[PDB]
Design a protein around this ligand. Structure first.
Ligand SMILES: CCCCCCCCCCCCCCCCCC(=O)OC[C@H](CO[C@@H]1O[C@H](CO[C@H]2O[C@H](CO)[C@H](O)[C@H](O)[C@H]2O)[C@H](O)[C@H](O)[C@H]1O)OC(=O)CCCCCCCCCCCCCCCCC
Ligand code: CLA
Ligand code: CLA
Ligand code: CLA
Ligand code: CLA
Ligand SMILES: CCCCCCCCCCCCCCCCCC(=O)OC[C@H](CO[C@@H]1O[C@H](CO)[C@H](O)[C@H](O)[C@H]1O)OC(=O)CCCCCCCCCCCCCCCCC
Ligand SMILES: CCCCCCCCCCCCCCCC(=O)OC[C@H](COP(=O)(O)OC[C@@H](O)CO)OC(=O)CCCCCCCCCCCCCCC
Ligand SMILES: CCCCCCCCCCCCCCCCCC(=O)OC[C@H](CO)OC(=O)CCCCCCCCCCCCCCCCC
Ligand SMILES: CC1=C(/C=C/C(C)=C/C=C/C(C)=C/C=C/C=C(C)/C=C/C=C(C)/C=C/C2=C(C)CCCC2(C)C)C(C)(C)CCC1
Ligand SMILES: CC1=C(/C=C/C(C)=C/C=C/C(C)=C/C=C/C=C(C)/C=C/C=C(C)/C=C/C2=C(C)CCCC2(C)C)C(C)(C)CCC1
Ligand SMILES: CC1=C(/C=C/C(C)=C\C=C/C(C)=C/C=C/C=C(C)/C=C/C=C(C)/C=C/C2=C(C)CCCC2(C)C)C(C)(C)CCC1
Ligand SMILES: CCCCCCCCCCCCC/C=C/[C@H](O)[C@H](N)CO
Ligand code: OEX
Ligand SMILES: [Cl-]
Ligand SMILES: [Cl-]
Ligand SMILES: [Fe+2]
Ligand code: NA
Lengths: 76, 348, 37, 449, 35, 44, 36, 31, 336
């Protein structure tokens, strides 16, 4: 029935988990370290917070053209 | 059903598969609860980790920017977006995911999926109670968290200017929301909120008292020093002395419970009633119908420079919360107020 | 700072406070090893 | 060890399994004493290694280096550190002694005698033997009296203990003629605990401190001899529960009272806890704010005696509830604060206006580090002062740290005293496990109504 | 006003004396349990 | 001064007493309770 | 089944979790979010 | 296996490990 | 034992036949709490205005001086007093004692002694009834919280004016000022306490639902289903076998709470330990240990301050800070 006590003790679990868990950890590490998190989720880099034109907190101030405007005042 | 032939269809097979004992129960409600709840928790954990709030609120609320667990949050959209549902395909995002994250659409995603997950969860409570043939008092009790969630995350922002004034999904975000209700609504002075506070405090009191009383009337039921192994689910006798408990609390407090029915119904009743009263109060606050002032007190203090109460002190504190919080709280309002018009006491 | 004859052992010193915290956790390890009998 | 099926105690109550095992109980005690001395030595070495000599000994998060520095080990006239070798020696000696104690505790826990009566009748003890328990209590009382007389010897003959009240800003001062007046010592112990007096946090001088230590050491030695050569009276037998759990609860209540009391010493006392080593107390830096702003605003030219605040009470000087002249700010609650930089400025009636105008000392002026930062604010994750302060300075007061922690552990130990006192009473009565279910006491009582 | 202090001191001393001597007066034997 | 005051707040008064009558009534009350308990102890 | 002790597995997972929490607390004093 | 238990356990476990590796990576990011 | 004065007094005090048990802890609980009740009621009804901040600016707090139940409060002691033990005999007149805040000190001291002796009396009744004694240990958490807000916090701040006012609007005032100066919301002990009351309500609702749902028929749609049998039988109703199955099937059927004793122990211990934690959080913030301070923790590559939800909380906190005691401060840095 595998009541979660025998599987954790068995080596069959840890043979296939000595690769999957470290590979996922390394995948997350590279996902952060390659800038892919910034590119995918749109968070600005520490050097990409203030553009030369605006030096204050950005404001969306529009609804139906919000996509075009956020493309305008984002970090290019 | 009801002594009929009832030729089988696809529904009978689907019901037989869904209503089976497993590691996790699925049921028909799992067609909604499992995806909606998984997406709500995953979206919250993703927004707290990667999705920024620099565009909408002008602040950092994610782990990629330097925020803690108590600090990062899934922030609400901008007030200029109003009550837009903020779909990915909607006119705001226009099918662009990386700008949909930047536009605060993840808050609407998490909120709608959490609401439907709560719906699916209390449906699951109904389905499991029907499978085990028990009354759905768990669902009746869970109706109050659903009411609180609906009134707080839906009804209040729909009454206000937009989703921007809704609670952002986080810790410091919720603290901001709480202080905003203190400064702008005088939420402590609201009798519905007072009823909710009484309900929660009385429910915690009931939990502690009931647990301590049962654990201190546990009977012998064994010879070892650990009473926990003295319990047997097979036996048909009560594990604690209700007569002894009743006499103890009658001579300590004056009143005591004599019915386990009434004791546990009261334990169910107090927090549900408190949370429902608080939900009604937040609904009242959704339209700024707040119990902010006492007219007699304010007229008395207006015509009397001597008359002061702690309520007047609270009113003065709320004024400072509003004045010193609005400029950095609402960037849409563009409140560039100078420091001299902001109120100050002496020397601080 | 430590005296000049004990300066290389200061990084060893920097870990020594946490050993009592490690002791109660060692007791928990021993309870796990005896399977909480 | 043993299992639950024989002892009756679960793993989360495993130390109860050695209640009746004298040798294992002794081993647990000796290993725990090794843990205490190990923390002392390790934390001392950590504080020495993390010690910057130019900064005072409170911007660095050091709590026990001030404890050695109060004794006079490596302390200059004004409060400078001179050398850290006594601190290093104390840490190393504690580490080695902890190694010895840990070896003994591990030995007696693992392969020592399981029970001490069958082979070592001097150390064997049953919890119901009142004469034996008073003998052990007498041995420990004599040991504690010797420990107090050790501090007395250090103060009297070994040229130690730092006096803040010495002129110029304190000095390591050898104490001559300690006040052994019974009236003074017991008037300290029987007086009010409130703001006017303070019950035990009122010692303003090392003479009274060392006189009280002489009294406590002599009394502890005499009481130890008394307990060695006596047996508890029948009234004490009828009043107390004689079991090992009840004795633990008595010790827990006493040590929780000690924990609250030490928290109060930490927050208010500036004599046994010098400000140069522990930072300002609660009342100071608040008195120092008013004092420094008074002297600054009279250095500009504005008079401070005839200057009133927005409420008409005095921006700098006012009168206390009693007619003493005190500082006029919101620090009127802290008008009882006595400091080495205040008393020469203070006179019989009040704050001595003429002394404020003319007889201010440059070292008292330079004692503005008391006020500047270092007021016992500081937040949990460090950062600066009040909760609305920004991330500028890395400081929390050591007085704040070892007052907050000590109040927390004192309250927990009061709770533990309640738990153990109740369970000891229930054990002596016979219903620690529950109700007998065939003859419960309630059915033998008349109903209330 | 001094007599108010005298009366309160008498009352407090009375109740504290009742507390102390009542707990001295065979308190561990006031149990229904056999022991 | 404009009124009569006890002026006992502070000054480290033992058990808070500032007159001998307070110490005497404390001792008398404790002694009376002790005497009743002593002549009336051991149940009988 | 029973090849590696369950208490040993739980102990190793406990050290990994404690180390991860230590890294998380150490990262609050360095880099982003360190207020410096 | 690939049953309901496997699917639920892995749908919880895999993104949590990915996110934990991501957060451990973000611990060493400096401005 | 029957013809002796102290005997008859002892077996009247320790008697379990009283309607309310008195005991040797009750001989101290009853007079102190009756004194506190009387003084609190009289002060709440007709207390003259009292100068809380020591700045000759009294606040009313009493109904006959023009306020309602919500805004009426027995106001704390004067700041000028400090924690200097001001009873009636230390005043020259009752009017002066009332103007300086003596009723608050009287009620708070008597209430602290009364709740401590109430806990002791709970233990005493548990001992005299053959019970187990840890109901007093459970009650030690609200006593700790009351001590923290009425005694310990004034001790740490140096003035009984810092005590929580005996009222509702005064309680809110104490809350807001405490927020402004200690950041209680960002204090982990306060988070533990909030989680404790929320989980206490959660577990109370769960326990009530599971015990009220798991029944066999004994009460019909009428008052009772006694048609099977009337009162006077030991054949028990209820269930904890199907309730545990429902709770298991609710999530994953491995978090086993099949032991009713373990379930009730958890119900007892969770809110008690969390209220212990939040009471000690208040006691630590009394000595200004305060909450988390993450103001301007997030800075960019050039070092500009990126705003934060913690920064918004900081703005609200300092807005509260400039309002508190508008006239009671003469110096910039708030230390006393
Ligand atoms: C199941 C599995 C097991 C689970 C267990 C879960 C329970 C507990 C887990 C651990 C609890 C602590 C976690 C945080 C540890 C940490 O991040 O560690 C925190 C600090 C961080 O280390 C250093 O802390 C310093 C703090 O400043 C200190 O030093 C400065 C000068 O350098 C100043 O002098 C300042 O005043 C002084 O406070 C600086 O910030 C350094 O940059 C920083 O690296 O380490 C330390 O101190 C370590 C703390 C030592 C113990 C102290 C105990 C508390 C004692 C008294 C306070 C009581 C409070 C009661 C109320 C609450
Ligand atoms: C201050 C902490 C402390 C101390 C000093 C002790 C001490 C003791 N416990 Mg105990 N315990 C503790 C905490 C502590 N415990 C905690 C927190 C729990 C709850 C998890 C328990 C639960 C518990 C149970 C259930 C039992 C004990 C038992 C015992 C006794 C014997 C252990 C034994 O025989 O098995 C042997 C143990 C080991 C072989 C592993 C320990 C390894 C050594 C001794 C320590 C680690 C190495 C150390 C660094 C060596 C120092 C080197 C030296 C040269 C300096 C012993 C006196 C037993 C008992 O009651 O006796 C009847 C028992 O069954 N404990
Ligand atoms: C006359 C016999 C005797 C003596 C001298 C001691 C002495 C001591 N016991 Mg011990 N004990 C005894 C009998 C004795 N015990 C017996 C029969 C039992 C039952 C088995 C125990 C059980 C016991 C336990 C369970 C524990 C102790 C502990 C301790 C130490 C506590 C003091 C401390 O660590 O703080 C600090 C010390 C001081 C402040 C004193 C300063 C040093 C002075 C100057 C030395 C005094 C010299 C003095 C002239 C000699 C004393 C004369 C003697 C006749 C009393 C201490 C050294 C505790 C321990 O393990 O500590 C390691 C502990 O946990 N004892
Ligand atoms: C009397 C107790 C006490 C006191 C007052 C202090 C005080 C201090 N310590 Mg210290 N320390 C202590 C005990 C104490 N310590 C112990 C027992 C250890 C051994 C582990 C250490 C090891 C230690 C180190 C290594 C360092 C300090 C440092 C410091 C200084 C800064 C502390 C800080 O950074 O934030 C304080 C940290 C906290 C407030 C963390 C809170 C932990 C709470 C109590 C957890 C409990 C919460 C809750 C109940 C959890 C429930 C879960 C549970 C069931 C498992 C400060 C003056 C630092 C220093 O400045 O060096 C000189 C330093 O680096 N300490
Ligand atoms: C020097 C004081 C002292 C001593 C000698 C004892 C001794 C004993 N206690 Mg006890 N206790 C104490 C203080 C003390 N206690 C205090 C202060 C409290 C209140 C918190 C308690 C509450 C308590 C309870 C509820 C119980 C005992 C029990 C026991 C017995 C078995 C202990 C055991 O093996 O559990 C195992 C030890 C552990 C599992 C470790 C405990 C982990 C704690 C709870 C988490 C906190 C640790 C963390 C590092 C600190 C965070 C900071 C802190 C300030 C919160 C034993 C004889 C048991 C008993 O009654 O047996 C008869 C039991 O049920 N105690
Ligand atoms: C719980 C945890 C407690 C933890 C720690 C407690 C530590 C120490 C507590 C005692 C410190 C003070 C020692 C006694 C001093 C004193 O009695 O002063 C008595 C003080 C001082 O009295 C005042 O003194 C002033 C001058 O200092 C003025 O003269 C005032 O007029 C005068 O009233 O008054 C009191 O505080 C009343 C005490 C009554 C206590 C009744 C307790 C009853 C409960 C149990 C009794 C058990 C036995
Ligand atoms: C010295 C002793 C110290 C304690 C004295 C103070 C205790 C006060 C008694 C509690 C109130 C009585 C509740 C009546 C209601 C009542 O008597 O109901 C009776 C009820 C007993 O129920 P039964 O077990 O009999 O239920 C079965 C019935 O349906 C069949 O008869 O008591 C309870 O519900 C349990 C205790 C709840 C008590 C809730 C506390 C409510 C707080 C009240 C606050 C008042 C406002 C503040 C004042 C302005
Ligand atoms: C102003 C200074 C402040 C500081 C001074 C404070 C001094 C406090 C001294 C109290 C010490 C008494 C310990 C007894 C504890 C209970 C013993 C018992 O359970 O006792 C019971 C026990 C059972 O056999 O009996 C016995 O062993 C009898 C032994 C008890 C001793 C009796 C005390 C002397 C009696 C004097 C009567 C006072 C009479 C009234 C005076 C009126 C003045 C006008
Ligand atoms: C019984 C038991 C127990 C307990 C145990 C214990 C408690 C132990 C211990 C122990 C101890 C208590 C130990 C200690 C120690 C110490 C040591 C081991 C040391 C040392 C030394 C050295 C080597 C040093 C060096 C140095 C110096 C000299 C200075 C400079 C620096 C350095 C560091 C280098 C438990 C709980 C587990 C469980 C149950 C059973
Ligand atoms: C060192 C020092 C000093 C000195 C001090 C002292 C001298 C102390 C003491 C003290 C004392 C001298 C104490 C005593 C005590 C006692 C106690 C604390 C007790 C008790 C107990 C109880 C609580 C009881 C209970 C009971 C009753 C009530 C009756 C019946 C029985 C019973 C048990 C139940 C000074 C400050 C000067 C200076 C600094 C340092
Ligand atoms: C967004 C979004 C989405 C969703 C997604 C999902 C549904 C997923 C996920 C996910 C997840 C789900 C993630 C996670 C995370 C987690 C974490 C990050 C964790 C952690 C941390 C920590 C720190 C922990 C600690 C602890 C505790 C407290 C418990 C036990 C012990 C330990 C130590 C482990 C999609 C794509 C559809 C689209 C739309 C939007
Ligand atoms: C209380 C402080 C005393 C200071 C001097 C200590 C000297 C120690 C002398 C011990 C007194 C001996 C009393 C003898 C008691 C006997 O065990 C029984 N009374 C025998 O009848
Ligand atoms: O009196 Mn109530 O309160 Ca403790 O802070 Mn400073 O002083 Mn007042 O201020 Mn915020
Ligand atoms: Cl001020
Ligand atoms: Cl205010
Ligand atoms: Fe129940
Ligand atoms: Na002001």
């Amino acid at each position: 029935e595998r009541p979660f006590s025998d599987i954790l003790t068995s080596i069959r679990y840890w043979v296939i988990h000595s690769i999957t868990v470290p590979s996922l950890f390394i995948a997350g590490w590279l996902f952060v370290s390659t800038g892919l998190a910034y590119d995918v989720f749109g968070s600005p880099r520490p050097n990409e917070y203030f553009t030369e034109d605006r030096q204050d907190a950005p404001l969306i101030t529009d609804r139906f053209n919000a996509l075009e405007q956020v493309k305008k005042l984002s970090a290019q | 059903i009801g002594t009929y032939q009832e030729k089988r269809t696809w529904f009978d097979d689907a019901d037989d598969w869904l209503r089976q004992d497993r590691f996790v129960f699925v049921g028909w409600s799992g067609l909604l609860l499992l995806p909606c709840a998984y997406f709500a928790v995953g979206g919250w954990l993703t927004g707290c980790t990667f999705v920024t709030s620099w565009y909408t609120h002008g602040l950092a609320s994610s782990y990629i920017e330097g925020c803690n667990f108590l600090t990062a949050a899934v922030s609400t959209p901008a007030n200029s977006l109003g009550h837009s549902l903020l779909f990915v395909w909607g006119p705001e995002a226009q099918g662009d995911l990386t700008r949909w994250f930047q536009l605060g659409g993840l808050w609407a995603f998490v909120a709608l999926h959490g609401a439907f997950g709560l719906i699916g969860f209390m449906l699951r409570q109904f389905e499991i109670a029907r499978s085990v043939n028990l009354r759905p008092y768990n669902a009746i009790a869970f109706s109050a968290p659903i009411a609180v969630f609906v009134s707080v995350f839906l009804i209040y922002p729909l009454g206000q200017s937009g989703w921007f004034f809704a609670p952002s999904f986080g810790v410091a975000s919720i603290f901001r929301f709480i202080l905003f209700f203190q400064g702008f609504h005088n939420w402590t002075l609201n009798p519905f909120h007072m009823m909710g506070v009484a309900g929660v405090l009385g429910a915690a009191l009931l939990c502690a008292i009931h647990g301590a009383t049962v654990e201190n009337t546990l009977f012998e039921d064994g010879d070892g020093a650990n009473t926990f192994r003295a319990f047997n689910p097979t036996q048909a006798e009560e594990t604690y002395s209700m007569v002894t408990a009743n006499r103890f609390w009658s001579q300590i407090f004056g009143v005591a419970f004599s019915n386990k029915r009434w004791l546990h119904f009261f334990m169910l009743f107090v927090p549900v009633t408190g949370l429902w009263m608080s939900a009604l109060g937040v609904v009242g606050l959704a339209l700024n119908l707040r119990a902010y002032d006492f007219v007699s007190q304010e007229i008395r203090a207006a015509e009397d420079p001597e008359f002061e109460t702690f309520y007047t002190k609270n009113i003065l504190l709320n004024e400072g919360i509003r004045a010193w919080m609005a400029a950095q709280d609402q960037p849409h309002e563009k409140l560039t107020l100078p420091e001299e018009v902001l109120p100050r006491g002496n020397a601080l | 700072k430590l005296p000049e004859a004990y300066a290389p052992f200061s990084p060893i010193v920097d870990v020594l406070p946490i050993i009592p915290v490690l002791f109660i956790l060692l007791a928990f390890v021993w309870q796990a090893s005896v399977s909480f009998r | 060890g043993r299992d639950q099926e024989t002892t009756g105690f679960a793993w989360w109550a495993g130390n109860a399994r050695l209640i009746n095992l004298s040798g294992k109980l002794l081993g647990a005690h000796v290993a725990h004493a090794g843990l205490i001395v190990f923390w002392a030595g390790a934390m001392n070495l950590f504080e020495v290694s993390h010690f910057v000599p130019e900064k005072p000994m409170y911007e660095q998060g050091l709590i026990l280096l001030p404890h050695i520095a109060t004794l006079g080990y490596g302390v200059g006239p004004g409060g400078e550190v001179l050398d850290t070798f006594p601190y290093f020696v104390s840490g190393v000696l504690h580490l080695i002694s902890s190694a010895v104690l840990g070896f003994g505790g591990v030995y007696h826990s693992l392969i020592g005698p399981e029970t001490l009566e069958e082979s070592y009748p001097f150390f064997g003890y049953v919890w119901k033997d009142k004469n034996k328990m008073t003998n052990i209590l007498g041995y420990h009382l004599i040991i504690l009296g010797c420990g107090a007389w050790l501090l007395v010897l250090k103060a009297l003959y070994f040229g130690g203990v730092y006096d803040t009240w010495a002129p110029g800003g304190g000095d390591v001062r050898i104490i001559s003629n300690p006040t052994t007046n019974a009236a003074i010592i017991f008037g300290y112990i029987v007086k009010s605990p409130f703001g006017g007096d303070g019950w035990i946090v009122s010692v303003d001088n090392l003479e009274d401190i060392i006189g009280g230590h002489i009294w406590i050491g002599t009394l502890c030695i005499l009481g130890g001899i008394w307990h060695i050569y006596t047996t508890p009276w029948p009234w004490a037998r009828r009043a107390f529960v004689w079991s090992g759990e009840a004795y633990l609860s008595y010790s827990l209540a006493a040590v929780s009272l000690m924990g609250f009391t030490a928290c109060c010493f930490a927050w208010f006392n500036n004599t046994a806890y010098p400000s140069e080593f522990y930072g300002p107390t609660g009342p100071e830096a608040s008195q120092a704010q008013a004092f420094t702003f008074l002297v600054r605003d009279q250095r500009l030219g504005a008079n401070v005696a005839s200057a009133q605040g927005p409420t008409g009470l005095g921006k700098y000087l006012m009168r206390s509830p009693t007619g003493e002249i005190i500082f006029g700010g919101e620090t009127m609650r802290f008008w009882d604060f006595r400091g080495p930089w205040v008393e020469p400025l203070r006179g019989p009636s009040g704050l001595d206006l003429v002394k404020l105008k003319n007889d201010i000392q440059p070292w008292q002026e330079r004692r503005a580090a008391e006020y500047m930062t270092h007021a016992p604010l500081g937040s949990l994750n460090s950062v600066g002062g009040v909760a609305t302060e920004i991330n500028a300075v890395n400081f929390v007061s050591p007085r704040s740290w070892l007052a907050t922690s000590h109040f927390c552990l004192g309250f927990f130990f009061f709770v533990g005293h309640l738990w153990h006192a109740g369970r000891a009473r229930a054990a002596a009565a016979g219903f620690e496990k529950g109700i007998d279910r065939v003859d419960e006491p309630v059915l033998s009582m008349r109903p209330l109504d | 006003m001094l007599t108010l202090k005298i009366f309160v001191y008498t009352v407090v001393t009375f109740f504290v004396g009742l507390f102390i001597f009542g707990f001295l007066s065979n308190d561990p034997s006031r149990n229904p349990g056999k022991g | 001064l404009v009124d009569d005051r006890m002026n006992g707040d502070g000054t480290g008064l033992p058990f808070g007493v500032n007159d001998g009558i307070l110490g005497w009534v404390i001792a008398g009350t404790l002694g009376t309770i002790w005497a009743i308990y002593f002549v009336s102890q051991k149940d009988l | 089944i029973g090849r590696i002790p369950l208490w040993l597995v739980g102990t190793v997972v406990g050290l990994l979790a404690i180390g991860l929490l230590a890294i998380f607390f150490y990262g609050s004093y360095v880099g982003l979010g360190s207020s410096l | 296996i690939f049953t309901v238990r496997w699917l639920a356990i892995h749908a919880i476990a895999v993104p949590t490990i990915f996110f934990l590796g991501a957060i451990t990576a973000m611990q060493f990011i400096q401005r | 034992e029957n013809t002796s004065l102290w005997a008859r007094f002892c077996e009247w005090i320790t008697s379990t036949e009283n309607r309310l048990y008195i005991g040797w802890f009750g001989v101290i609980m009853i007079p102190t709490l009756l004194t506190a009740i009387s003084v609190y009621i009289i002060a709440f009804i007709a207390a003259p205005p009292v100068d809380i901040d020591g700045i000759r600016e009294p606040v009313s707090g009493s109904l006959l001086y023009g306020n309602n139940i919500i805004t009426g409060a027995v106001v704390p002691t004067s700041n000028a007093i400090g924690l200097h033990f001001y009873p009636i005999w230390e005043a020259a007149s009752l009017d002066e004692w009332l103007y300086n805040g003596g009723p608050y000190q009287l009620v708070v001291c008597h209430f602290f002694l009364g709740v401590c002796c109430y806990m002791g009396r709970e233990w005493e009744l548990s001992y005299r009834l053959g019970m187990r004694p840890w109901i007093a240990v459970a009650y030690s958490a609200p006593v700790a919280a009351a001590t923290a807000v009425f005694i310990i916090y004034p001790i740490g701040q140096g003035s009984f004016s810092d005590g929580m006012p005996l009222g509702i609007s005064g309680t809110f005032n104490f809350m807001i000022v405490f927020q402004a100066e200690h950041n209680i919301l960002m204090h982990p002990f306060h988070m533990f306490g909030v989680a404790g009351v929320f989980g206490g309500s959660l577990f109370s609702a769960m326990h009530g639902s599971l015990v009220t749902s798991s029944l066999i028929r004994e009460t019909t749609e009428n008052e009772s289903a006694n048609a099977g049998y009337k009162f006077g039988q030991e054949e028990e109703t209820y269930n904890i076998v199907a309730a545990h199955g429902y709770f298991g099937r609710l999530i994953f059927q491995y978090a086993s709470f099949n032991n009713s004793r373990s379930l009730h122990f958890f119900l007892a211990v969770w809110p008690v330990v969390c209220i212990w934690l939040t009471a000690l959080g208040i006691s630590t913030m009394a000595f200004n240990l305060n909450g988390f301070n993450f103001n301007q923790s997030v800075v960019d590559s050039n070092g500009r301050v990126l705003n934060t939800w913690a920064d918004i909380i900081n703005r609200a906190n300092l807005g509260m800070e400039v309002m508190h005691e508008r006239n009671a401060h003469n110096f910039p840095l708030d230390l006393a």
